[PDB]
Ligand binder design. Structure first.
Ligand code: HEM
Length: 117
Protein backbone atom coordinates (compact mmCIF):
# COMPACT_ATOMS: atom_id res chain seq x y z
CA UNK A 1 0.00 0.00 0.00
CA UNK A 2 2.37 2.64 -1.34
CA UNK A 3 0.68 4.62 -4.10
CA UNK A 4 3.06 2.85 -6.51
CA UNK A 5 1.65 -0.52 -5.30
CA UNK A 6 -1.96 0.72 -5.37
CA UNK A 7 -1.44 1.75 -9.05
CA UNK A 8 -0.20 -1.76 -9.82
CA UNK A 9 3.56 -1.69 -9.31
CA UNK A 10 6.26 -1.91 -11.98
CA UNK A 11 4.32 -3.31 -14.98
CA UNK A 12 1.63 -0.72 -14.39
CA UNK A 13 4.12 2.15 -14.26
CA UNK A 14 5.86 0.91 -17.48
CA UNK A 15 2.46 1.00 -19.27
CA UNK A 16 1.39 4.36 -17.76
CA UNK A 17 4.46 6.51 -18.64
CA UNK A 18 4.31 5.97 -22.44
CA UNK A 19 0.56 6.47 -22.44
CA UNK A 20 1.05 9.70 -20.48
CA UNK A 21 3.54 10.85 -23.15
CA UNK A 22 1.12 9.86 -25.92
CA UNK A 23 -1.42 12.30 -24.32
CA UNK A 24 1.11 15.07 -23.47
CA UNK A 25 2.44 14.98 -27.04
CA UNK A 26 -1.10 15.45 -28.35
CA UNK A 27 -1.95 18.34 -25.96
CA UNK A 28 -1.67 21.80 -27.64
CA UNK A 29 -0.80 23.30 -24.27
CA UNK A 30 2.45 21.42 -23.82
CA UNK A 31 3.44 19.11 -26.72
CA UNK A 32 5.80 21.63 -28.26
CA UNK A 33 8.10 21.68 -25.13
CA UNK A 34 9.16 18.15 -26.16
CA UNK A 35 10.09 18.97 -29.75
CA UNK A 36 13.85 18.26 -29.32
CA UNK A 37 13.54 15.67 -26.48
CA UNK A 38 15.11 12.20 -26.70
CA UNK A 39 11.83 10.39 -25.84
CA UNK A 40 13.55 7.07 -24.92
CA UNK A 41 15.72 8.92 -22.36
CA UNK A 42 12.88 10.94 -21.11
CA UNK A 43 10.49 7.91 -20.73
CA UNK A 44 13.20 6.18 -18.67
CA UNK A 45 13.85 9.24 -16.39
CA UNK A 46 10.17 9.93 -15.84
CA UNK A 47 9.49 6.20 -15.10
CA UNK A 48 12.34 6.32 -12.48
CA UNK A 49 11.08 9.64 -11.09
CA UNK A 50 7.40 8.71 -10.65
CA UNK A 51 8.43 5.29 -9.37
CA UNK A 52 10.55 6.99 -6.69
CA UNK A 53 7.98 9.74 -5.87
CA UNK A 54 5.07 7.34 -5.46
CA UNK A 55 6.86 4.97 -3.00
CA UNK A 56 8.36 2.33 -5.36
CA UNK A 57 12.11 1.63 -5.63
CA UNK A 58 14.32 4.72 -5.65
CA UNK A 59 16.64 4.51 -8.68
CA UNK A 60 16.06 8.12 -9.83
CA UNK A 61 19.41 9.64 -10.83
CA UNK A 62 18.12 12.57 -12.76
CA UNK A 63 17.98 16.29 -12.32
CA UNK A 64 15.96 18.02 -9.57
CA UNK A 65 12.72 19.75 -10.65
CA UNK A 66 14.16 23.26 -10.83
CA UNK A 67 17.21 22.10 -12.89
CA UNK A 68 15.05 19.90 -15.14
CA UNK A 69 12.91 22.91 -16.24
CA UNK A 70 15.50 25.66 -15.96
CA UNK A 71 15.13 28.32 -18.66
CA UNK A 72 11.58 27.13 -19.70
CA UNK A 73 9.77 29.79 -17.56
CA UNK A 74 6.90 27.34 -17.23
CA UNK A 75 3.47 28.76 -16.32
CA UNK A 76 0.65 27.42 -14.21
CA UNK A 77 -1.43 26.34 -17.18
CA UNK A 78 1.45 24.08 -18.32
CA UNK A 79 1.61 22.32 -14.94
CA UNK A 80 -2.22 21.85 -14.90
CA UNK A 81 -1.99 20.26 -18.33
CA UNK A 82 0.67 17.75 -17.21
CA UNK A 83 -1.43 16.73 -14.14
CA UNK A 84 -4.58 16.45 -16.28
CA UNK A 85 -2.80 14.18 -18.73
CA UNK A 86 -1.37 11.93 -16.00
CA UNK A 87 -4.86 11.73 -14.44
CA UNK A 88 -6.48 10.84 -17.78
CA UNK A 89 -3.72 8.20 -18.39
CA UNK A 90 -4.30 6.47 -15.05
CA UNK A 91 -8.11 6.67 -15.53
CA UNK A 92 -7.85 5.08 -19.01
CA UNK A 93 -5.71 2.30 -17.40
CA UNK A 94 -8.57 1.59 -14.90
CA UNK A 95 -7.16 3.35 -11.75
CA UNK A 96 -9.89 4.61 -9.33
CA UNK A 97 -10.35 8.34 -8.69
CA UNK A 98 -9.21 7.97 -5.02
CA UNK A 99 -5.83 6.51 -6.07
CA UNK A 100 -5.35 9.10 -8.90
CA UNK A 101 -5.99 11.78 -6.30
CA UNK A 102 -3.40 10.41 -3.90
CA UNK A 103 -0.81 10.35 -6.70
CA UNK A 104 -1.69 13.87 -7.85
CA UNK A 105 -1.46 15.17 -4.25
CA UNK A 106 2.19 13.99 -4.03
CA UNK A 107 3.14 15.37 -7.51
CA UNK A 108 1.47 18.70 -6.90
CA UNK A 109 4.20 19.59 -4.28
CA UNK A 110 6.66 19.92 -7.25
CA UNK A 111 4.78 22.85 -8.82
CA UNK A 112 6.70 25.61 -7.03
CA UNK A 113 10.05 23.98 -7.91
CA UNK A 114 9.47 24.16 -11.63
CA UNK A 115 7.25 27.18 -12.50
CA UNK A 116 9.00 30.34 -13.67
CA UNK A 117 12.54 28.85 -13.86
C1 HEM B 1 4.80 22.08 -16.05
C2 HEM B 1 4.68 21.50 -17.23
C3 HEM B 1 5.96 20.70 -17.65
C4 HEM B 1 6.59 20.77 -18.86
C5 HEM B 1 6.15 21.65 -20.04
C6 HEM B 1 7.72 19.83 -18.79
C7 HEM B 1 8.64 19.66 -19.81
C8 HEM B 1 9.83 18.98 -19.66
C9 HEM B 1 10.85 18.86 -20.71
C10 HEM B 1 10.63 19.50 -22.10
C11 HEM B 1 11.92 18.16 -20.23
C12 HEM B 1 13.18 17.65 -21.01
C13 HEM B 1 14.20 18.67 -21.44
C14 HEM B 1 14.89 17.67 -22.44
O1 HEM B 1 15.65 16.78 -21.88
O2 HEM B 1 14.51 17.58 -23.68
C15 HEM B 1 11.59 17.76 -18.85
C16 HEM B 1 12.39 17.05 -18.00
C17 HEM B 1 11.83 16.38 -16.92
N1 HEM B 1 10.60 16.66 -16.33
FE1 HEM B 1 9.16 17.96 -16.91
N2 HEM B 1 7.81 19.22 -17.52
C18 HEM B 1 6.70 19.70 -16.84
C19 HEM B 1 6.31 19.26 -15.57
C20 HEM B 1 6.79 18.13 -14.96
C21 HEM B 1 6.21 17.39 -13.80
C22 HEM B 1 4.85 17.77 -13.17
C23 HEM B 1 7.09 16.39 -13.51
C24 HEM B 1 7.02 15.23 -12.50
C25 HEM B 1 6.25 15.43 -11.47
C26 HEM B 1 8.19 16.46 -14.48
C27 HEM B 1 9.32 15.68 -14.48
C28 HEM B 1 10.40 15.75 -15.30
C29 HEM B 1 11.54 14.84 -15.17
C30 HEM B 1 11.78 13.63 -14.24
C31 HEM B 1 12.48 15.29 -16.26
C32 HEM B 1 13.83 14.61 -16.58
C33 HEM B 1 14.98 15.32 -15.93
C34 HEM B 1 16.25 14.56 -16.34
O3 HEM B 1 16.36 14.26 -17.60
O4 HEM B 1 17.16 14.36 -15.50
N3 HEM B 1 7.93 17.53 -15.22
N4 HEM B 1 10.36 18.32 -18.59
Amino acid sequence: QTIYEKLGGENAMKAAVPLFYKKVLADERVKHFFKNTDMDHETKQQTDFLTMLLGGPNHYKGKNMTEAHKGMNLQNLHFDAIIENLAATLKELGVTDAVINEAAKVIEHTRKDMLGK
